[PDB]
Short mmCIF file of C-alpha atoms in Angstrom, two decimals:
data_model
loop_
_atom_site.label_atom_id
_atom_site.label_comp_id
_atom_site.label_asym_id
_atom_site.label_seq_id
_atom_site.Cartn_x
_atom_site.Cartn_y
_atom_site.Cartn_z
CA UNK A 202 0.00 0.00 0.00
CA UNK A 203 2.22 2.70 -1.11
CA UNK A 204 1.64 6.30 -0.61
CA UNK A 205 -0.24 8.23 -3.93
CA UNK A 206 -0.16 11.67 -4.36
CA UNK A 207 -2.74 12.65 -1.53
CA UNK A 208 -0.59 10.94 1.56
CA UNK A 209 2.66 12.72 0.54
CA UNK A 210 1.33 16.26 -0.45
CA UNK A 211 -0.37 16.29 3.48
CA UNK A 212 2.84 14.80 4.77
CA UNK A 213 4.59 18.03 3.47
CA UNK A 214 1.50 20.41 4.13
CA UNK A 215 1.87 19.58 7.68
CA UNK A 216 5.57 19.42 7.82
CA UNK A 217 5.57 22.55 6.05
CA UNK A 218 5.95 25.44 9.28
CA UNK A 219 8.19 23.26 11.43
CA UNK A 220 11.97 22.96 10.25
CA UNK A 221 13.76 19.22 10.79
CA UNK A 222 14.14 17.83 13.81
CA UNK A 223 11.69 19.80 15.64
CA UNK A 224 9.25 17.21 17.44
CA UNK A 225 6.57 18.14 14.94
CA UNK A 226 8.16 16.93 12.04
CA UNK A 227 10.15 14.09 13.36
CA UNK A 228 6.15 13.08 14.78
CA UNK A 229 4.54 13.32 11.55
CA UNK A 230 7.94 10.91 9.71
CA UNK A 231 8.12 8.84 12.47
CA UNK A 232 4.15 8.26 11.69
CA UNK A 233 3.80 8.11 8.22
CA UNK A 234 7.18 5.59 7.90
CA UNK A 235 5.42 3.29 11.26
CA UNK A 236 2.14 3.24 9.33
CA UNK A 237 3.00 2.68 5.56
CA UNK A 238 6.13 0.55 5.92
CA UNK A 239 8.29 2.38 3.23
CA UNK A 240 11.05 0.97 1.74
CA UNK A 241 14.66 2.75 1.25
CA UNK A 242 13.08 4.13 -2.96
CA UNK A 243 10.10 5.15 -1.04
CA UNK A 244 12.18 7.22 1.84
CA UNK A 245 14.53 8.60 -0.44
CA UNK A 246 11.15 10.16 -2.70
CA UNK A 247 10.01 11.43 0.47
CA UNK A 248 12.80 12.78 1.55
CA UNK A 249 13.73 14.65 -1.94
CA UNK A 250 9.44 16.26 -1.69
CA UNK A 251 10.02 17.97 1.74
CA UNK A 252 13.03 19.36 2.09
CA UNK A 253 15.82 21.61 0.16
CA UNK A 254 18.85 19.44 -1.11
CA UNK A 255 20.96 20.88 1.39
CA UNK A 256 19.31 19.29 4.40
CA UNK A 257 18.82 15.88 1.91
CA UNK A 258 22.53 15.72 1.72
CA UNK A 259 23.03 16.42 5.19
CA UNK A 260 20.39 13.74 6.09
CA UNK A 261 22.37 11.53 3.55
CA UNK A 262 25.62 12.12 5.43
CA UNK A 263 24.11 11.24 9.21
CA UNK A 264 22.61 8.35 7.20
CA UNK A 265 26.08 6.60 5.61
CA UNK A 266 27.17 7.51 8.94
CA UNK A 267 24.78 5.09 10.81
CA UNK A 268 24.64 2.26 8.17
CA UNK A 269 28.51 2.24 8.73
CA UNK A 270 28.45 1.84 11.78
CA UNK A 271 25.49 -0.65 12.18
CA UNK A 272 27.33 -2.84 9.64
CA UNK A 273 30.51 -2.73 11.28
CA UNK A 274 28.91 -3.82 14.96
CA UNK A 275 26.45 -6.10 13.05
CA UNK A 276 23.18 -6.48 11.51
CA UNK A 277 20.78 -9.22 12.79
CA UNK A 278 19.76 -10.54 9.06
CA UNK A 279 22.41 -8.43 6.65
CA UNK A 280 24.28 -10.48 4.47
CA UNK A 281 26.53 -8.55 2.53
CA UNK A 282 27.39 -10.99 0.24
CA UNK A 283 24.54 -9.73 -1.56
CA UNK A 284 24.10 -5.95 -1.88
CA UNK A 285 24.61 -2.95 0.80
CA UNK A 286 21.34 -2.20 3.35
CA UNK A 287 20.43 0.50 0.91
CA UNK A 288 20.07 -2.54 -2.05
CA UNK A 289 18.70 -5.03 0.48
CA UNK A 290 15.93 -2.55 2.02
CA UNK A 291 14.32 -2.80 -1.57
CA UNK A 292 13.51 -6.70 -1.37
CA UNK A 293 9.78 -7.27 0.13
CA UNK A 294 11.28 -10.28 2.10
CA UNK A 295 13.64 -8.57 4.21
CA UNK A 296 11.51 -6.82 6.64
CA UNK A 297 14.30 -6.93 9.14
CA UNK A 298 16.60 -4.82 6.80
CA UNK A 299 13.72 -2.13 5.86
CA UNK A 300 12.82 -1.76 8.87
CA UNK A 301 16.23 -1.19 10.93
CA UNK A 302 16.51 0.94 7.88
CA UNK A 303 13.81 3.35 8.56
CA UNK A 304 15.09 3.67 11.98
CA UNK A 305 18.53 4.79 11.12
CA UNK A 306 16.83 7.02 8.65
CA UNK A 307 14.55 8.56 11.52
CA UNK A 308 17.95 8.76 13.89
CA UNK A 309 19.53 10.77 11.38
CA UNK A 310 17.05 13.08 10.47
CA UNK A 311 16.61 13.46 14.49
CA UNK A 312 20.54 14.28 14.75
CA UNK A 313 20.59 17.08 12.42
CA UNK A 314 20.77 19.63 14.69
CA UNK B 146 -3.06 4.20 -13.50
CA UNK B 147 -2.99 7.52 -14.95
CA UNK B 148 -3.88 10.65 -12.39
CA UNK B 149 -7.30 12.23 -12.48
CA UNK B 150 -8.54 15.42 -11.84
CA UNK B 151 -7.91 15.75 -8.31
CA UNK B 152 -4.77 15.08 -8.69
CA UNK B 153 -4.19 17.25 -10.91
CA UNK B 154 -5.27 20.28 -8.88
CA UNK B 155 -3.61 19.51 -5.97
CA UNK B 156 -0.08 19.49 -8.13
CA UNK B 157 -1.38 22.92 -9.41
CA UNK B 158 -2.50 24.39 -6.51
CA UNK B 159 0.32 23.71 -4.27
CA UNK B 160 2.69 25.15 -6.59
CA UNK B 161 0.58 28.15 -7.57
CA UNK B 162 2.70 31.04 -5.68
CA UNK B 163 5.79 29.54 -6.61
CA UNK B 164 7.55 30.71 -9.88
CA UNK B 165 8.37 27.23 -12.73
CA UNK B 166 11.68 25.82 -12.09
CA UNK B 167 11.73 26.67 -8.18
CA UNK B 168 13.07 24.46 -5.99
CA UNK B 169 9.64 23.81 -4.94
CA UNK B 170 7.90 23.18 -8.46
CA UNK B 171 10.89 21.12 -8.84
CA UNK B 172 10.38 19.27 -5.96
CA UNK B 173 6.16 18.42 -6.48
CA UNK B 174 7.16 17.73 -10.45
CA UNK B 175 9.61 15.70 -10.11
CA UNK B 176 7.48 13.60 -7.15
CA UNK B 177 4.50 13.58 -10.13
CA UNK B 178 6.63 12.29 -13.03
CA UNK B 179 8.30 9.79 -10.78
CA UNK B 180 5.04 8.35 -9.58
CA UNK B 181 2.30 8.56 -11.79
CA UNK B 182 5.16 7.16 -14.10
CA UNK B 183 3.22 9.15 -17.09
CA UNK B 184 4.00 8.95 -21.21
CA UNK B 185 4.95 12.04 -23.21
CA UNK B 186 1.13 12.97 -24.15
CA UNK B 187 0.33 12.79 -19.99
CA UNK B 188 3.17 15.51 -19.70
CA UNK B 189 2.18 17.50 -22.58
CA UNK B 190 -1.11 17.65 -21.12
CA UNK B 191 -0.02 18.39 -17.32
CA UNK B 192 2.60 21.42 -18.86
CA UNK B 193 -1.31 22.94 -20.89
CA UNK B 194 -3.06 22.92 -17.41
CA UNK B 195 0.24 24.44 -15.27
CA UNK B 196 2.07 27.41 -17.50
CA UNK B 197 0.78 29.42 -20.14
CA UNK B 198 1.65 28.98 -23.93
CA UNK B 199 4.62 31.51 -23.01
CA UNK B 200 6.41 28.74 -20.87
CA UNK B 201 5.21 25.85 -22.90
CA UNK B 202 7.01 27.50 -25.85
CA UNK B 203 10.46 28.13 -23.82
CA UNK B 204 10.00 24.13 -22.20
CA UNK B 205 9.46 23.04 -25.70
CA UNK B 206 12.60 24.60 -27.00
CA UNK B 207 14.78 23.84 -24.44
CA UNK B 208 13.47 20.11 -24.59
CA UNK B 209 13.77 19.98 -28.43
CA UNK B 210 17.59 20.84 -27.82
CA UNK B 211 17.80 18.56 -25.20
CA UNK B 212 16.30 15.40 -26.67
CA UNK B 213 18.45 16.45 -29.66
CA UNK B 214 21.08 15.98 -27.83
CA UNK B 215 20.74 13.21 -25.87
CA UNK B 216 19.72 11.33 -28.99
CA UNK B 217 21.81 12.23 -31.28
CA UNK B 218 24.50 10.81 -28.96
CA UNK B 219 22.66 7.77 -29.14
CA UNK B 220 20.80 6.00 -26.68
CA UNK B 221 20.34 2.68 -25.43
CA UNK B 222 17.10 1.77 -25.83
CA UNK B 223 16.74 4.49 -28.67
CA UNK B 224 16.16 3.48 -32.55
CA UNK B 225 15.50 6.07 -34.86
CA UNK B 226 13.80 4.10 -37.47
CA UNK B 227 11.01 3.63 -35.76
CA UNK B 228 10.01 7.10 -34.99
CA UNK B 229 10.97 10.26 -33.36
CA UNK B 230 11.14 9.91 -29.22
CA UNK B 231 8.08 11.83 -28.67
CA UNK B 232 6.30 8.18 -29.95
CA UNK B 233 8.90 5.99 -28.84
CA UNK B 234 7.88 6.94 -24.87
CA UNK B 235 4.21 6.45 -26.06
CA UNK B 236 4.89 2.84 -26.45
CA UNK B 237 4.07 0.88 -22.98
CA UNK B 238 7.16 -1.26 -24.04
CA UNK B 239 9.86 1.05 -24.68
CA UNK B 240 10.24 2.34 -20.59
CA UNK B 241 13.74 3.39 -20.67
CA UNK B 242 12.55 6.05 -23.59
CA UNK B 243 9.33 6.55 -21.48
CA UNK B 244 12.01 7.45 -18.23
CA UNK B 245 14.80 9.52 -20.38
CA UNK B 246 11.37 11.08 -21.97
CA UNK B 247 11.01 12.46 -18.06
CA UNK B 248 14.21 13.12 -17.40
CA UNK B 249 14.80 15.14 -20.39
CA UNK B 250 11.40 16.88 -19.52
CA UNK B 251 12.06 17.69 -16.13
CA UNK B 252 15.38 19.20 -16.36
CA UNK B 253 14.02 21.63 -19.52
CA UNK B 254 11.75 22.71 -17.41
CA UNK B 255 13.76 23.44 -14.76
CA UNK B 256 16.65 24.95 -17.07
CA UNK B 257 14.08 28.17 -17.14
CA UNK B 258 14.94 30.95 -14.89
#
């Protein structure tokens, strides 16, 4: 059940006065990503409709910077021998992967300031 | 699974105070093209509804020049005795025309101001 038009253009009407990481917007990602179940494509669209490409790249920094680290102290079901997080997030039967994903994603777009 | 009217004047109305090609026309465009995952004639017809025959002139220049480049470079998926682009991404079987089609598209239009 992926997000059409409607659910994204609220997302970003309501996450339009608040700036990232204020508790508003962090509530309405961390609600939207817990109810729809997005994988990494589906994040990264998000992410390019709200916000300038400044604060994408930024986001995109704090987010290598997780995934780094999670793979270096370990992963419960990533197997590299296959493709990085952000290739095995996009596979329907890896719900473990997409959704550890989504939580470094929210982490890092928490961290920014 | 082509949009319908609603969805058509939410894209417009969002985007009414901003100017074409501004980050945030850019941003609710791009989000369109790369969902609704539209053909050339789609486009044509969502360019008619948003900007007057002034900017549908200056897009269609600037995408003339930039299809003619791209395919006179030659193209993957691209061969020219078949027909000129425009129909090639009108063919349900031809999507990596129907995707450089909205690439192509989306960066004329942004090449504006």
């Amino acid at each position: 059940r992926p997000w059409q038009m409607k659910d994204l253009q609220a997302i970003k009407q309501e996450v339009s006065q608040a700036a990232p990481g204020s508790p508003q917007f962090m509530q309405t990602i961390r609600l939207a990503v817990q109810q729809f179940d997005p994988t990494a494509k589906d994040l990264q669209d998000l992410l390019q409709y709200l916000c300038s490409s400044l604060v994408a790249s930024l986001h995109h920094q704090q987010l290598d910077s997780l995934i780094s680290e999670a793979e270096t102290r370990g992963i419960t079901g990533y197997n590299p021998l296959a493709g990085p997080l952000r290739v095995q997030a996009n596979n329907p039967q890896q719900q473990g992967l997409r959704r550890e994903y989504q939580q470094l994603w929210l982490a890092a777009f928490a961290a920014l300031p």
